[PDB]
mmCIF file of C-alpha atoms and ligand atoms in Angstrom:
data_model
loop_
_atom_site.group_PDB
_atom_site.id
_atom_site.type_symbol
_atom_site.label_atom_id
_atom_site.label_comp_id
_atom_site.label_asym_id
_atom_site.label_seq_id
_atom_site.Cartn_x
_atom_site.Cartn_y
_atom_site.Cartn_z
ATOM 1 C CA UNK L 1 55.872 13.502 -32.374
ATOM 2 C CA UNK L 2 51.778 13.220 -33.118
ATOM 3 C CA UNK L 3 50.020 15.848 -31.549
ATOM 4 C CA UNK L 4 46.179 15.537 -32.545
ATOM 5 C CA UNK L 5 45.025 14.008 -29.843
ATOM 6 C CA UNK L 6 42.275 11.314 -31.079
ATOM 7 C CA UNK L 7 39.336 10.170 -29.257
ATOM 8 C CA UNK L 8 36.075 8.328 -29.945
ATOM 9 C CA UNK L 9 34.148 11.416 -31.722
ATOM 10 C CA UNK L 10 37.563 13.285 -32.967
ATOM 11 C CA UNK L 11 38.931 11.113 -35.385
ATOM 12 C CA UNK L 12 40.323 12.455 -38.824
ATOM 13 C CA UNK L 13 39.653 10.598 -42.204
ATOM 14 C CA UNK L 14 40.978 10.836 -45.709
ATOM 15 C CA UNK L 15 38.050 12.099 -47.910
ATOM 16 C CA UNK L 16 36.722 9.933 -50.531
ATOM 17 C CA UNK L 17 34.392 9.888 -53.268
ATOM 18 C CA UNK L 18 31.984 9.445 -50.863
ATOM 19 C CA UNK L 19 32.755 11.661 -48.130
ATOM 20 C CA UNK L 20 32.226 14.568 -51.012
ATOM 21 C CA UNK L 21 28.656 13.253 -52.190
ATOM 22 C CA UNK L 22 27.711 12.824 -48.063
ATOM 23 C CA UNK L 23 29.014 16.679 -47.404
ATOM 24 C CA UNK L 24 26.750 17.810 -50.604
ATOM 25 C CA UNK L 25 24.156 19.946 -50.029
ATOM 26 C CA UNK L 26 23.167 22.743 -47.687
ATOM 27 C CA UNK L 27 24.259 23.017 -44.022
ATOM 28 C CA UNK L 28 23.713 24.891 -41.293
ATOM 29 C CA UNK L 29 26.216 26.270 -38.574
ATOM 30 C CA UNK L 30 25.261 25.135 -35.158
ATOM 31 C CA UNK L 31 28.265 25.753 -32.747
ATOM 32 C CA UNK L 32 31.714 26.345 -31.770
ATOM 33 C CA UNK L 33 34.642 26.644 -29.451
ATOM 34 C CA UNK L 34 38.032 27.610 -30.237
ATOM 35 C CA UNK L 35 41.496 28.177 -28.308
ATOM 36 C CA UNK L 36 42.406 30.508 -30.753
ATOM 37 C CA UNK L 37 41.750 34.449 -30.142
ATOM 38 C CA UNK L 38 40.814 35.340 -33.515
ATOM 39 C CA UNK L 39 38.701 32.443 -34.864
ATOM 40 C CA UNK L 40 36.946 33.678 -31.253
ATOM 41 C CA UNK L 41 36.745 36.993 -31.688
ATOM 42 C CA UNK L 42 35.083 36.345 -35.061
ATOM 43 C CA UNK L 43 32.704 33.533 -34.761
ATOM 44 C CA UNK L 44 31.028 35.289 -31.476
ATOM 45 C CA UNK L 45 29.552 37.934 -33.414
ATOM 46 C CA UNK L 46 27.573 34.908 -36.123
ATOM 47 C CA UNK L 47 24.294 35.105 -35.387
ATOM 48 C CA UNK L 48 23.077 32.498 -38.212
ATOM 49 C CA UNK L 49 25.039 30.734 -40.931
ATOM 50 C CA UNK L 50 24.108 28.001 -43.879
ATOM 51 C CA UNK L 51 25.732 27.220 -46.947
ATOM 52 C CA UNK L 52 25.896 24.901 -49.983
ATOM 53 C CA UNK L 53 29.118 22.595 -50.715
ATOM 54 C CA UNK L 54 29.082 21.537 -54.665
ATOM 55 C CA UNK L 55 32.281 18.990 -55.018
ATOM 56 C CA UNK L 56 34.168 18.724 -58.215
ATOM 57 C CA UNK L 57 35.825 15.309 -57.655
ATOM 58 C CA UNK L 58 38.170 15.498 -60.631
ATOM 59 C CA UNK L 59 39.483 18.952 -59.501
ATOM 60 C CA UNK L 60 39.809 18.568 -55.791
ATOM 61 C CA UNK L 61 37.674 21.586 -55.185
ATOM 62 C CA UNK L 62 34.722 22.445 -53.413
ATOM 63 C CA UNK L 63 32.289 24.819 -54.360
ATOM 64 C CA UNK L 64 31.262 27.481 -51.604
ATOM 65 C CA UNK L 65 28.001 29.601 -50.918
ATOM 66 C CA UNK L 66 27.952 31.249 -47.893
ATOM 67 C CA UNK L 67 25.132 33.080 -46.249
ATOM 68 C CA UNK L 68 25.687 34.348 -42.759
ATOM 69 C CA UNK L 69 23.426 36.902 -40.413
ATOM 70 C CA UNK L 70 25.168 39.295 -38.065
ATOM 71 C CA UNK L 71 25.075 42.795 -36.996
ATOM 72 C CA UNK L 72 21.378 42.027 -37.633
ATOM 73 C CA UNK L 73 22.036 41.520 -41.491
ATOM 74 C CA UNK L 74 22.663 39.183 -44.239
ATOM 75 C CA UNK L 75 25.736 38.778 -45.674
ATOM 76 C CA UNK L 76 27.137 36.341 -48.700
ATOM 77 C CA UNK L 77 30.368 34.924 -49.974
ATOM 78 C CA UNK L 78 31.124 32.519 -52.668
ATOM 79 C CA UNK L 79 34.099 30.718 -53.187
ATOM 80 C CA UNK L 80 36.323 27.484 -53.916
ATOM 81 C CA UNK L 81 37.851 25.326 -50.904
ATOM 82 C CA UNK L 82 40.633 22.761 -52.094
ATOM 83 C CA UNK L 83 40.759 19.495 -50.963
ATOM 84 C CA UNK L 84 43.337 17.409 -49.588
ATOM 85 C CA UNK L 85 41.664 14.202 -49.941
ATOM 86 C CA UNK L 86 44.530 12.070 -48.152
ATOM 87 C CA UNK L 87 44.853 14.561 -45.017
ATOM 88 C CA UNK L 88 41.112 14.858 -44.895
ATOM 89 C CA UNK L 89 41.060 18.174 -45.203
ATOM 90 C CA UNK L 90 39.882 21.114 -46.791
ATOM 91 C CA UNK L 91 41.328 24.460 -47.056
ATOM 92 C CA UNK L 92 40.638 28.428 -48.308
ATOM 93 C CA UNK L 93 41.734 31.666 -48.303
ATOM 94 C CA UNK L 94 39.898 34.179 -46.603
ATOM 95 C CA UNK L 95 40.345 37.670 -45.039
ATOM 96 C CA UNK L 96 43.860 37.784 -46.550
ATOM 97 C CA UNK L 97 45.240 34.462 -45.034
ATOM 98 C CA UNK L 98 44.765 30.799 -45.464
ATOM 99 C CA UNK L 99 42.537 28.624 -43.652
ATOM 100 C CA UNK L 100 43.096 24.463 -43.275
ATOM 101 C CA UNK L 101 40.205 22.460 -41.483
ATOM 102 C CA UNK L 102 39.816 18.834 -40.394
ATOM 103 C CA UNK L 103 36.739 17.162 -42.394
ATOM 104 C CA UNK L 104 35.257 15.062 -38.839
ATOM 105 C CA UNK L 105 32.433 13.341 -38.483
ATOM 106 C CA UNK L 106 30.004 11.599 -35.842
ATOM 107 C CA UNK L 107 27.649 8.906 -35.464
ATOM 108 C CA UNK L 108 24.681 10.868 -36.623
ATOM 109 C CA UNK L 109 24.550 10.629 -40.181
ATOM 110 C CA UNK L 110 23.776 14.059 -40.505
ATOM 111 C CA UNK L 111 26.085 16.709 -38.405
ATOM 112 C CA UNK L 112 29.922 17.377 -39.483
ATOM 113 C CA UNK L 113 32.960 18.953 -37.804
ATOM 114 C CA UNK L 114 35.802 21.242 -38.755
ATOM 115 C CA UNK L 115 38.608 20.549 -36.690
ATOM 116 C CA UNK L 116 40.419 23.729 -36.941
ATOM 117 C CA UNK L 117 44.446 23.833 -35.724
ATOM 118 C CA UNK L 118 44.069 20.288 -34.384
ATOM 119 C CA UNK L 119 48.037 19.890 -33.939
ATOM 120 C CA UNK L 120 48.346 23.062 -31.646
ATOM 121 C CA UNK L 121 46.966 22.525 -28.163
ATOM 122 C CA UNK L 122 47.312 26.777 -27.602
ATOM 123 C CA UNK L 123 44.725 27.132 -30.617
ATOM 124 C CA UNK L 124 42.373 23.967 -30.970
ATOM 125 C CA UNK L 125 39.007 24.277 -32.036
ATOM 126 C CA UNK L 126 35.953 22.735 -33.243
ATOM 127 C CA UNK L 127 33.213 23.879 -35.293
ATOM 128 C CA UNK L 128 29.540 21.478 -35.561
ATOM 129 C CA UNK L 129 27.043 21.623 -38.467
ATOM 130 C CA UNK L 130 23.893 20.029 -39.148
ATOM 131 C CA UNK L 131 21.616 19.332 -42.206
ATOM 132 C CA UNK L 132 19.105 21.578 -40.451
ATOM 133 C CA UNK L 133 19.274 24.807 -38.402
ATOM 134 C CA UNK L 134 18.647 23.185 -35.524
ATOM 135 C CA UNK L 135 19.488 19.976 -33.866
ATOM 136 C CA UNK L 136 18.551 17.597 -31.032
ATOM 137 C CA UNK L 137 19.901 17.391 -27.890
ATOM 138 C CA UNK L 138 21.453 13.941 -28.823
ATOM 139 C CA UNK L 139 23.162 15.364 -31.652
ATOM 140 C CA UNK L 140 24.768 18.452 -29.830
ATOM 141 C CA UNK L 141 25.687 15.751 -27.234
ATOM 142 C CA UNK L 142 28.157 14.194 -30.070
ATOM 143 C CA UNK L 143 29.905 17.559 -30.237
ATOM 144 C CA UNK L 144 30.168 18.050 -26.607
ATOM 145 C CA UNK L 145 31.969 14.683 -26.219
ATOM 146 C CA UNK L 146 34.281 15.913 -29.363
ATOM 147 C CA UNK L 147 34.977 19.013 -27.481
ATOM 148 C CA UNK L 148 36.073 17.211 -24.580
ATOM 149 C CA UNK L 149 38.982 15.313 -26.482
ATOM 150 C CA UNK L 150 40.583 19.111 -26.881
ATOM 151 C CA UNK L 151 39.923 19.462 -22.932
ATOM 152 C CA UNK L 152 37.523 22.606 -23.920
ATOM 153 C CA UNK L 153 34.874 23.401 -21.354
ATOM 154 C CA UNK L 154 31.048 23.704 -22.449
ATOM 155 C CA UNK L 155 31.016 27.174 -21.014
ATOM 156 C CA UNK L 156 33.195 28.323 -24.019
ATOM 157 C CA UNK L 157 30.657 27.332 -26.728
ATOM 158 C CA UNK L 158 29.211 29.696 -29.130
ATOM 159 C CA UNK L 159 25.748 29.345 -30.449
ATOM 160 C CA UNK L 160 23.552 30.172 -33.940
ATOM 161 C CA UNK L 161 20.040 30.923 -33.084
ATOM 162 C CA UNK L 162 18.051 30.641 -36.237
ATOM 163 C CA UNK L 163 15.174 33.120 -34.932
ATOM 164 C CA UNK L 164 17.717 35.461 -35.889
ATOM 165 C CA UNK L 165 18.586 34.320 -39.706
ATOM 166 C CA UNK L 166 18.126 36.916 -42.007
ATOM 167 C CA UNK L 167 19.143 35.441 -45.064
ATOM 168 C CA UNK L 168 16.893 32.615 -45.618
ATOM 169 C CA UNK L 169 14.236 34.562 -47.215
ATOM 170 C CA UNK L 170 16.447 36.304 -49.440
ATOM 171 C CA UNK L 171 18.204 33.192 -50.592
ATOM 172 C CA UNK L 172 16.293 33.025 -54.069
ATOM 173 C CA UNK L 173 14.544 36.173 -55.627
HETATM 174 C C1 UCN T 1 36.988 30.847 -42.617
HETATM 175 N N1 UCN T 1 36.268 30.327 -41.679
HETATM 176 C C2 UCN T 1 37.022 30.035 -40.667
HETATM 177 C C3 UCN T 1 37.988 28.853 -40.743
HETATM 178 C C4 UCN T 1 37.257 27.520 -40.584
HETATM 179 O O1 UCN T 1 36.336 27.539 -39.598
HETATM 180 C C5 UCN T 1 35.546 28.557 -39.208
HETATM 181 C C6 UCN T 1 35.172 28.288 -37.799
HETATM 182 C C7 UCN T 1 36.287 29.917 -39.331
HETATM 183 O O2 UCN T 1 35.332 30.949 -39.244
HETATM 184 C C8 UCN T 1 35.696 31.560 -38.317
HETATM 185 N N2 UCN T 1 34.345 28.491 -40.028
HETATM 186 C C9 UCN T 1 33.078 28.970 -39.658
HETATM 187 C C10 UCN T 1 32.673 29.595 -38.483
HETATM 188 C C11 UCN T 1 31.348 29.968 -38.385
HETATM 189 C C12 UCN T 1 30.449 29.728 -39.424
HETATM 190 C C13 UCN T 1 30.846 29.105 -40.596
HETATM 191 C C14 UCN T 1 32.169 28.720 -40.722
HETATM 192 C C15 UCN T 1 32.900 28.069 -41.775
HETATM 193 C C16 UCN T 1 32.624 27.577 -43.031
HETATM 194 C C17 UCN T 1 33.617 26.982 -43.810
HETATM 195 C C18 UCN T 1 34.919 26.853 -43.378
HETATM 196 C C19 UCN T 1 36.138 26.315 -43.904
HETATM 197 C C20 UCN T 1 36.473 25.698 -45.098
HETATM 198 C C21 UCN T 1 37.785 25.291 -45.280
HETATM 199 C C22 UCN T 1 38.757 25.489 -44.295
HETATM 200 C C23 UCN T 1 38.457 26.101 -43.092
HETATM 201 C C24 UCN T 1 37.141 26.508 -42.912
HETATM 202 N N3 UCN T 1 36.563 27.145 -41.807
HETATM 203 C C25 UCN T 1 35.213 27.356 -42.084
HETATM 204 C C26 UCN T 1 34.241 27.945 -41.308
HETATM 205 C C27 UCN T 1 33.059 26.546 -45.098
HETATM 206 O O3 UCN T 1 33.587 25.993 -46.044
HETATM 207 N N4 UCN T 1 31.703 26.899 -45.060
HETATM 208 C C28 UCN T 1 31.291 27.473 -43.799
HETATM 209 O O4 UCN T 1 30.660 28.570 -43.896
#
């Protein structure tokens, strides 16, 4: 049977129209906590991400730049996510493999979720994004109560600190 389990901040969506003109723009990576090893292993080394999502509604793609600080440096990746507009949600290949993620949002307007393997309580994760590179306390609070749908303590979240962005400055020029 079902095995997402859904709760008042983790509820999946088909994407619209709309949902691709809300998620256009630039976003920032705020946090994240994951069951799964790798995605763990990975994301705990991010010291700073943003990027820019550019729909193309007729081809069910997505239009990726990616600009991420760790190690102390800035890196970049562009790319093309597809879209599975009636699952809600978006997918990519990356480092050799494929990667699906829930589209999930909140009651602030402007933070988003990936739900990453939602269906697989050994691997369940969520990653939170704002429209800045920081957020309020009442914002973060939305993710936390996400979090707690996949039974994930606070203690295992992962977090950006912009002081350490590199790649803003380099951005344009
Ligand atoms: C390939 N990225 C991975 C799979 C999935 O979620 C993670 C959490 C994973 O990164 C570990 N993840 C991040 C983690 C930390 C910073 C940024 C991202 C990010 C972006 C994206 C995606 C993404 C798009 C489509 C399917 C799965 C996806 N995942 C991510 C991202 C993205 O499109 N822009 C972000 O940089």
């Amino acid at each position: 049977g079902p095995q997402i389990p859904l709760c008042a901040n983790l509820v999946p969506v088909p994407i619209t129209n709309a949902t691709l003109d809300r998620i256009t723009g630039k976003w920032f990576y705020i946090a994240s906590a994951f069951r799964n090893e790798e995605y763990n292993k990975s994301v705990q080394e991010i010291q700073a991400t943003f990027f820019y999502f550019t729909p193309n509604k007729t081809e069910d793609t997505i239009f990726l730049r990616e600009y991420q600080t760790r190690q102390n440096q800035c890196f970049y990746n562009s790319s093309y996510l597809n879209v599975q507009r009636e699952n809600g949600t978006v997918s990519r290949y990356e480092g050799g493999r494929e990667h699906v993620a829930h589209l999930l949002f909140l009651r602030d307007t402007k933070t988003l979720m990936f739900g990453s393997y939602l269906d697989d309580e050994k691997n369940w994760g969520l990653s939170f994004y704002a429209d800045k590179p920081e957020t309020t306390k009442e914002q973060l609070g939305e993710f936390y109560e996400a979090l707690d749908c996949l039974r994930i303590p606070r203690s295992d979240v992962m977090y950006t600190d912009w002081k350490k962005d590199k790649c803003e400055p380099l951005e344009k020029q």
